[PDB]
Amino acid sequence: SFHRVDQKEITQLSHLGQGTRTNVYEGRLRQELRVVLKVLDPSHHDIALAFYETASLMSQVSHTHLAFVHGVCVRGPENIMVTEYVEHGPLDVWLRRERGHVPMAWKMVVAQQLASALSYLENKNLVHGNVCGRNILLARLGLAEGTSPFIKLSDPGVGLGALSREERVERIPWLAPECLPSTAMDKWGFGATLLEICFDGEAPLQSRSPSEKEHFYQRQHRLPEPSCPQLATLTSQCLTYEPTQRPSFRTILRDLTR
Amino acid sequence: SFHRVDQKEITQLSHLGQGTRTNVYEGRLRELRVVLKVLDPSHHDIALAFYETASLMSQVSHTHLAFVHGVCVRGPENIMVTEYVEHGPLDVWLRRERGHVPMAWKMVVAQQLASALSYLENKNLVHGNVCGRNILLARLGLAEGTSPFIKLSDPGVGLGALSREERVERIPWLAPECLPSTAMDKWGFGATLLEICFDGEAPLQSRSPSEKEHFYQRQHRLPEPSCPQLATLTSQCLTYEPTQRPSFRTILRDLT
Numbered sequence A: 001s002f003h004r005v006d007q008k009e010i011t012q013l014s015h016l017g018q019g020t021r022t023n024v025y026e027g028r029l030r031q032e033l034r035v036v037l038k039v040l041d042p043s044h045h046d047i048a049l050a051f052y053e054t055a056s057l058m059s060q061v062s063h064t065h066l067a068f069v070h071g072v073c074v075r076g077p078e079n080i081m082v083t084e085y086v087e088h089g090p091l092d093v094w095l096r097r098e099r100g101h102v103p104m105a106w107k108m109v110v111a112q113q114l115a116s117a118l119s120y121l122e123n124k125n126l127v128h129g130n131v132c133g134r135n136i137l138l139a140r141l142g143l144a145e146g147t148s149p150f151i152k153l154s155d156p157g158v159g160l161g162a163l164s165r166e167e168r169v170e171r172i173p174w175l176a177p178e179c180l181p182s183t184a185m186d187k188w189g190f191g192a193t194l195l196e197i198c199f200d201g202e203a204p205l206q207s208r209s210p211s212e213k214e215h216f217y218q219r220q221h222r223l224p225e226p227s228c229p230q231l232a233t234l235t236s237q238c239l240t241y242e243p244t245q246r247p248s249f250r251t252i253l254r255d256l257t258r
Numbered sequence B: 001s002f003h004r005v006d007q008k009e010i011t012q013l014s015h016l017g018q019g020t021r022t023n024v025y026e027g028r029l030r031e032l033r034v035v036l037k038v039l040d041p042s043h044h045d046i047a048l049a050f051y052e053t054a055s056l057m058s059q060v061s062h063t064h065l066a067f068v069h070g071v072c073v074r075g076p077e078n079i080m081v082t083e084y085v086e087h088g089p090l091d092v093w094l095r096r097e098r099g100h101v102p103m104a105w106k107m108v109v110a111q112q113l114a115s116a117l118s119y120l121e122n123k124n125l126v127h128g129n130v131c132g133r134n135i136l137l138a139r140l141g142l143a144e145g146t147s148p149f150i151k152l153s154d155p156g157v158g159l160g161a162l163s164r165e166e167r168v169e170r171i172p173w174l175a176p177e178c179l180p181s182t183a184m185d186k187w188g189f190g191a192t193l194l195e196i197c198f199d200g201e202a203p204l205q206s207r208s209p210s211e212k213e214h215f216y217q218r219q220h221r222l223p224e225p226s227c228p229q230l231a232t233l234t235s236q237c238l239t240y241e242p243t244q245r246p247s248f249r250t251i252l253r254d255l256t
């Protein structure tokens, strides 16, 4: 399951963002490590249980491209997951700031590294369920000459099962359409993230309204094809409404290495 | 000497601070993110000292030395266009992270500062403004197994063009021989290592100009660093006799 952390061992620093029912802060863990604290909102037992399952999944795994989870601190109305601090933070933010100046090869190295960590979770028959640019952290940047990127996939936060329909609609286009009303969902998540990467942090449908987003899935519309034809075949296969028709990560990984 | 930049190619954004006769702003260069060092309305000797600074930085190349794009000169305007280093001045970071900066982190910063100064020593060039504020953090070195990465900024208006009042303001970083050679950067380095050790708090910093001048006039020596890891190096560097200061080749070997 997961390691337990005392309130005394953690220091909450600057605010980094807000997730689904969470607030993200930089922090210190006690000699002293830089950590990232995911503070759950005052929640019911079913919400908190979904949070512990997330901590468990991440605690019980080990992969070079998967972010480490130290444990969980239980403090009054808040629950605090203590996770790995990664030098450069989310990928989507860096993609928007570096818009137009990110090489194909850089995006191609990041695809393989994401497939590998997901291939690893596929072999263990485990589900991430929140693959998106925001959950991709850059350990090493790779935008500078002679540098190659190194990513770590973050924890998926509160499990998708505990979210309302409104919250699941907010996750379009990354949310697999079968989850709107299995490991197959991470292949859709992966395909949508590859489109976000290709479009330098701009996911299709991101700007559009919840009704427009729901309508797109309700009408079985397909997402745009990526700008780079090296991934067009892979994304079309991944972003199919039939879960069984999505390739395995073992296949995906072989297709990128060629 | 230096590259010339047109007024049209630069956009001045937010104000970051004030230096000796300058105002530091964030900006864009045609749009690449830069730092603009806007010289105050100055006389020709002041502007000439500003161009010499741009030259020194333009004509060098080092991994731990900040890049200078060029200078924009139009009417009374003198704008040095320099590299934007992600996290900014080291002294600011050090005060905000006071008590939580490891000894190992500081030695990295020290070796990298010593490297960019050994490089300038081999080319027989003078920086003349080594201080925490002129040390910029490119990479923070906060994640496990990662090291900080620094870049030494341009020294701003050359020390030669400054008044006595302005030189007194530079104590304890200003070498005492400059109060009334490459040897000065060894004092600058020594004083910066004390500032780093004391988490951004340089000794004498709070004290008055008369108190500061009095300290140098009376030949008093600066406090010894908290970490005995650098106590021998700083005592050697912060000697009033310029010739008695070790070379950066020596300093670098002592740090490795």
Ligand SMILES: CNC(=O)c1cnc(Nc2cc(C)c(F)cn2)cc1Nc1cccc(C(=O)NCc2ccccn2)c1OC
Pocket (backbone or CB within 6 Å): A016, A017, A018, A019, A020, A024, A036, A067, A068, A083, A084, A085, A086, A087, A088, A089, A090, A132, A134, A135, A136, A137, A153, A154, A155, A157
């Ligand atoms: C497991 N470790 C992590 O999560 C982690 C590690 N290191 C970081 N470093 C770092 C470093 C710098 C310099 C920096 F400026 C920012 N951050 C950031 C990390 N998290 C993180 C940070 C900020 C926002 C989010 C966030 O919006 N989360 C909620 C969300 C919204 C939408 C979709 C998905 N999730 C966030 O979570 C990914």
Ligand SMILES: CNC(=O)c1cnc(Nc2cc(C)c(F)cn2)cc1Nc1cccc(C(=O)NCc2ccccn2)c1OC
Pocket (backbone or CB within 6 Å): B016, B017, B018, B019, B020, B024, B035, B066, B067, B082, B083, B084, B085, B086, B087, B088, B089, B131, B133, B134, B135, B136, B153, B154, B156
């Ligand atoms: C090559 N250009 C640089 O050095 C530079 C590059 N990147 C920066 N990034 C950055 C980033 C963040 C997040 C930030 F919040 C600020 N800045 C800041 C940079 N300069 C800079 C900025 C502000 C003040 C000074 C300054 O006090 N100068 C005058 C002075 C006073 C006393 C002693 C010596 N010099 C200053 O110059 C060092």
